């Protein structure tokens, strides 16, 4: 009675594919054809933040567009002042293998996690004047891959156990679990309204989750390999993904399908990170070949290149007001472009 | 003004304290050897540990040198994402139990680790385990799999243990040469392999890890000078 449901799923997915093909009427490269290009984008390294001992695996900007946190495999979280280049905090972690870090939208907390399967919350205000662990969210069965604050009391975490989870920080329990993926969940992105979030996994599929209900609204296929990065379009109606098959995609939400592919022949390395500019016109993407590419998110043509890292580009973040880009790399340097 | 200058100089003093602490941590970091203890299902690496949660840490000293060994637990059977976190360790200790076909699985995993693009500068200290268990392997099962074991002559070069039957010697050198056939087809000279025969009860395993870490550091130093 297994082949019964296998065949029924085959017919249902074929019906969904036919509906998707019916809703398509004209490519995005046919509607943005008469628009004018962005020219050549030229950014320059403004700052270079030095001080990490091992490779940098993640960074995250604050909402004031000045401070940023950064995670390294030496066991340190460093909070930087990006205007003055001064270090503000330097937090030694219990486990050296950290794969994610997050900065609270209020600037009061920092989270990190990695191969120890724990998300540790760090109080930064701590009137006593001592950055100490305020919470330890245990319960995942695989390594922590991403984490993002919704409030100072809730946080969404993805894990290498193929699940995401919504946590209650002050209580310590996970109030929701999101189970649809068959591979490692590598990344997640919150919508501007934080009622939805999208998450890509190692099964080559992305999923849209309702945070307050706890179900999978839609599922987005189209990539051939593992999805390493995922980001929302500034208005919350589309999202871009970066994969190991050396392409990016645009994936409209209300059309329920993919709009555009950002590929190039001499690019045969995987994408590690993606981000949009404030207007959503440029799509920045970090690669395994030590470089970043500025993509025209509407014409699919390449606009610029951010060269200057000597190892793998691991993380990438555009600031909240759109005034600078920060890239971290496995060479243990953070650079700020403009 | 006054408050702007006070804030800026307080920022500078905090940055100086932080950089002082980072200078102090850099010396402890540079003077430690990080090892990734990896293994398979049958292969008992806990006997390698008893002589020395998502990850376990084990600190031990050899001749005033500090070693830091990590063994993954509570991680799924898919290693392609989290194995990249271990490209800057000094060595991957690969424990394999010589005796489903577990040896072909060990060989495929060693091939995957060897030929990965991020682990192509990491050395592998291979521990071919349970050589004594091969002594009670007298019935004639290493012939079902690996049919090229019939026309195999033991290497007269290497010398076995005094008082060992030739079956175990030929079998263990055949398996060592399987792993060496994998590790030699590279033709690189950028990362090196150290095959050892170990057992459940031993004393020289720590000394072996120490000697191979020394050799790894010496080859890295000689490549920075372009003498190798």
């Amino acid at each position, epitope marked *: 009675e297994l082949d019964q449901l*296998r065949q029924e799923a085959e017919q249902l997915k074929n019906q969904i594919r036919d509906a998707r093909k019916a809703c398509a009427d004209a490519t995005l490269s046919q509607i943005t054809n008469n628009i004018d290009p962005v020219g050549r984008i030229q950014m320059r390294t403004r700052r270079t933040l030095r001080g990490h001992l091992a490779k940098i695996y993640a960074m995250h900007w604050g909402t004031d567009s000045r401070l940023l946190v950064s995670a390294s495999q030496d066991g340190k979280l460093i909070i930087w002042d990006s205007y003055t280049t001064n270090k503000v905090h330097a937090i030694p972690l219990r486990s050296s293998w950290v794969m994610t870090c997050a900065y609270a939208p209020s600037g009061n907390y920092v989270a990190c996690g990695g191969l120890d399967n724990i998300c540790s919350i760090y109080n930064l205000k701590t009137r006593e004047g001592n950055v100490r662990v305020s919470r330890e969210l245990a319960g995942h069965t695989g390594y922590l891959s991403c984490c993002r604050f919704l409030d100072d009391n809730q946080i969404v975490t993805s894990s290498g156990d*193929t699940t995401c989870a919504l946590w209650d920080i002050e209580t310590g329990q996970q109030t929701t679990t999101f189970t649809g993926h*068959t*591979g490692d969940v590598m990344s997640l992105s919150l919508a501007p309204d934080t009622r939805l979030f999208v998450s890509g996994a*190692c*099964d*080559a*599929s992305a999923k849209l989750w309702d945070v307050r209900e706890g179900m999978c609204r839609q599922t987005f*296929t*189209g990539h*051939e*390999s*593992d999805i390493n990065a995922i980001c929302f379009f500034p208005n919350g109606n589309a999202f871009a993904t970066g994969s*190991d*098959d*050396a392409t990016c995609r645009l994936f409209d939400l209300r059309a329920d399908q993919e709009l555009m592919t950002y590929s190039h022949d001499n690019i*045969i390395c*995987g994408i590690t990170s993606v981000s949009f500019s404030k207007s959503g016109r440029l799509l920045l993407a970090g690669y395994d070949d030590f470089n970043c590419n500025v993509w025209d998110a509407l014409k699919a043509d390449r606009a610029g290149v951010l060269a200057g890292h000597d190892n793998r580009v691991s993380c990438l973040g555009v600031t909240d007001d759109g005034m600078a880009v920060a890239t971290g790399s496995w060479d243990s340097f953070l650079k700020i472009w403009n | 003004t006054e408050d702007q200058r006070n804030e800026e100089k307080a920022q500078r003093e905090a940055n100086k304290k932080i950089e002082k602490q980072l200078q102090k941590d850099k010396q402890v970091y540079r003077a430690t050897h990080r090892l990734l203890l990896l293994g398979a299902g049958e292969s008992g690496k806990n006997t390698i540990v008893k002589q020395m949660s998502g990850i376990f840490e084990t600190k031990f000293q050899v001749d005033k040198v500090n070693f830091h060994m990590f063994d993954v637990g509570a991680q*799924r*059977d*898919e*290693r*392609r994402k989290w194995i990249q976190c271990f490209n800057d360790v000094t060595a991957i200790i690969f424990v394999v139990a010589s005796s*489903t*076909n577990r040896l*072909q*699985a060990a060989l*495929k995993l060693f*091939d*995957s*680790i*060897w*030929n*990965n*693009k991020w682990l192509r500068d990491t050395s592998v200290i291979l521990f071919l385990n349970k050589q004594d268990l091969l002594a009670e392997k007298v019935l004639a099962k290493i012939e*079902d*799999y*690996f*049919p*090229e074991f019939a026309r195999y002559t033991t290497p007269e070069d290497a010398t076995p243990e005094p008082g060992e039957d030739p079956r175990v010697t030929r079998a263990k050198y055949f398996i060592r040469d399987e792993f060496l056939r994998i590790s030699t087809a590279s033709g690189d000279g950028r990362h090196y392999c150290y095959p050892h025969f170990t057992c459940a009860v031993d004393t020289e395993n720590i000394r072996r890890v120490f000697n191979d870490c020394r050799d790894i550091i010496q080859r890295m130093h000689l490549r920075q000078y372009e003498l190798l």
Partner: nanobody
Amino acid sequence: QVQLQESGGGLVQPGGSLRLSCAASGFTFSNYKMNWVRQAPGKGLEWVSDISQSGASISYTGSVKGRFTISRDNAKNTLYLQMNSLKPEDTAVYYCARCPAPFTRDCFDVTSTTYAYRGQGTQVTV
């Protein structure tokens, strides 16, 4: 979407022969190394054979070397396994697996549970 569909079934008498085939869909078949994997009744998944992108490098497990033949048709996006001189220990469900990423040498795809780019199998009974 990535999907793999195998075809070929039992039961064949000992000494017979059958040819497994797999129709790939959803990816550039020419960029990936392909494998054959099998699961005997009451055991884990074990690796059988693999072929490289062009078809030059070929490798077999120990107990099939000489009897089986792997080959791929990059134009038709198809993978074949020609099984000759079958023995009763070849009874197993055979899955076609794909390397996780393109232009690579390594592969991590014998995962005895929940690997994404593997087919759903086809039963072989000798």
